[PDB]
Amino acid sequence: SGFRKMAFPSGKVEGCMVQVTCGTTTLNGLWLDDVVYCPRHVICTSEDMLNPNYEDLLIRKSNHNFLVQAGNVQLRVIGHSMQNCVLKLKVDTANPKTPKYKFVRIQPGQTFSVLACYNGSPSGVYQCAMRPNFTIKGSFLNGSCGSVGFNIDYDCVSFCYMHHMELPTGVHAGTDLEGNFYGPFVDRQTAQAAGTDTTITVNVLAWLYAAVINGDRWFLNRFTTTLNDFNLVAMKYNYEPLTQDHVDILGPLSAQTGIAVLDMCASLKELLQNGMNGRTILGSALLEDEFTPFDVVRQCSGVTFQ
Amino acid sequence: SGFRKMAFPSGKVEGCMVQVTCGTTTLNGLWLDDVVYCPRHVICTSEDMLNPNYEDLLIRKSNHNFLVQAGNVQLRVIGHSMQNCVLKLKVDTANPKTPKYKFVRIQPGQTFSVLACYNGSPSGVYQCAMRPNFTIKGSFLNGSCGSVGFNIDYDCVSFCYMHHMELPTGVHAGTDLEGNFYGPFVDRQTAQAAGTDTTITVNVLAWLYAAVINGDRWFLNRFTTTLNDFNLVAMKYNYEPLTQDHVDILGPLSAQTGIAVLDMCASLKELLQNGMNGRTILGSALLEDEFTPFDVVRQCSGVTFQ
Numbered sequence A, B: 001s002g003f004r005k006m007a008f009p010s011g012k013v014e015g016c017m018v019q020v021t022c023g024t025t026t027l028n029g030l031w032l033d034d035v036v037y038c039p040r041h042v043i044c045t046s047e048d049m050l051n052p053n054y055e056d057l058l059i060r061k062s063n064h065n066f067l068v069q070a071g072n073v074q075l076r077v078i079g080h081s082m083q084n085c086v087l088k089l090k091v092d093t094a095n096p097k098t099p100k101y102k103f104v105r106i107q108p109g110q111t112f113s114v115l116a117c118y119n120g121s122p123s124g125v126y127q128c129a130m131r132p133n134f135t136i137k138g139s140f141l142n143g144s145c146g147s148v149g150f151n152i153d154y155d156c157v158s159f160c161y162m163h164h165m166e167l168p169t170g171v172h173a174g175t176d177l178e179g180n181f182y183g184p185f186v187d188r189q190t191a192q193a194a195g196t197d198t199t200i201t202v203n204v205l206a207w208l209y210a211a212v213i214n215g216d217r218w219f220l221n222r223f224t225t226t227l228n229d230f231n232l233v234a235m236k237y238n239y240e241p242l243t244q245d246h247v248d249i250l251g252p253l254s255a256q257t258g259i260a261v262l263d264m265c266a267s268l269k270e271l272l273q274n275g276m277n278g279r280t281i282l283g284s285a286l287l288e289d290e291f292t293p294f295d296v297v298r299q300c301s302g303v304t305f306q
């Protein structure tokens, strides 16, 4: 028993992390086979960041302008190209520790593990959700750009996030590994703001199921509701609409516990209206929304990798 | 900016995890040089667990009774011995992935990363603290025994915890890597209870410093207090006594922020007395006590390893 914010083991991803230096700028790169992936803003001076012409700035660079270091070993750059906001540095050496991998674009509400890196070396690992407003609530300092987010999907490292920037509100913005930003953000030092954020409703229900599995039952009532009546209450407290798709993916946790999804919706409805009655759920005084239904299954089943 | 519950990268420890089978029992082992470390209760039947004599039980075992698997490869056992509650299996092969390592016995309030494992394979990584009552609030299922807790101290993996059991309250008990239990617990299916748990006062103060560093500052007053006056208030809320040793360890965060330790104690005193008034600190409605003073420095300075 017990329930913690749990990250994927980081070893497979640690083996891919490299240092990319261009001019006086150093950040992190992802080394997969004979290509290194990093944010294209590595090629910018502070002045370039104000209004960058990336097509022109990339053409003006030669392969010799890029210093790539895998630990203490220098990797010779033999080619440079752009895919959207990601720089691709072709090198003369394939990474022998390249895991079986995919590039995937995740939906708002989906979680992933972040390996926070500086100078191509890991600092630590933590769990993040893609927020409904397409930001993430990270822990990232100057030099963290090119740190990646991932899941392990059976036998495959699914890379879903590369870190690009921090908004003045202190939340984080980045791209998939095809270099396409999550949300309406751009890799230039212009005034940008995230939309109003909402609570991930399907994730709150998943976490209440996790609490029942671990023996917490005080919040369970004898009531049930409809999806429509739940959603009328949900919208008032800045919760995302629960869809029929959400009810289906909670099915496994409903099966495990024998508590119908719409019974747990009635319990959540009472918690939102009347509060937590001076009590905690899994060591929290607030309703947690950064566990997906499958995050609960993986932790409470003891799913392993390799 | 941002502050998250952050674990060490798990890769160095992943390279040391093996599967240990004795009869119909399989759990996890730690492979360092030519020794595999695991809980001695691996040699017990469910019947033996009720009233084990480990000295007699181990006499009855041969080297051949231990199946050690490093992935798909069997490691031949050439010796077995007991050190307190830890079994040491000498094998014919030294682990080529052995990092620089120390065995350390940690104090109550000290934090560490857990690599939770099943069948010698990793499930996930999370951060824990040694509680004042010598339990840990883990996430552990059947098959998790031999999972280890660690810190990375410069370029050295400091192993501090091996997992042995779950108490009926749903908290966890285990040993250092010399096999000495934290707290008054034994590896036998006997009636056992942890002492009443207390809040780790020095850790709460460290987390308030982390909040100021990230710009969360509403809880700061310019009240003064003495250590003795603070402790008279603190003890009433089931907080550990704060010593002058504790005041010194917060010194670095006081230096960074320019808020004196006893000024932050005055602010904590007000939060205890008056509550949070429906506000949050780093997205929490309760006072967090599982960040050490150095955990704050590591995360906010971007410490990396090797």
Ligand SMILES: O=C1C[C@H]2CCCN2C(=O)c2cncc(c2)/C=C/CCCCCOC(=O)[C@@H](Cc2ccc(Cl)cc2)N1
Binding pocket: A041, A049, A140, A141, A142, A143, A144, A145, A164, A165, A166, A167, A168, A186, A187, A188, A189, A190, B001
């Ligand atoms: O995003 C950052 C910087 C980031 C990007 C270049 C290098 N960078 C990091 O190395 C870094 C990564 N992650 C976290 C941090 C720093 C923390 C910073 C603290 C102060 C933040 C104050 C508000 O910053 C901003 O609005 C944008 C403004 C901005 C947006 C886009 C670009 Cl192309 C350049 C600047 N600046």
Ligand SMILES: O=C1C[C@H]2CCCN2C(=O)c2cncc(c2)/C=C/CCCCCOC(=O)[C@@H](Cc2ccc(Cl)cc2)N1
Binding pocket: A001, B041, B049, B140, B141, B142, B143, B144, B145, B164, B165, B166, B167, B168, B186, B187, B188, B189, B190
């Ligand atoms: O500690 C466990 C079992 C643990 C030890 C053998 C294998 N073990 C795990 O594989 C395991 C590790 N960690 C978490 C779990 C299981 C979770 C279990 C859910 C039920 C918990 C109900 C309460 O269990 C107990 O009091 C003691 C009773 C007990 C105490 C000491 C011993 Cl030497 C044997 C049994 N049993």
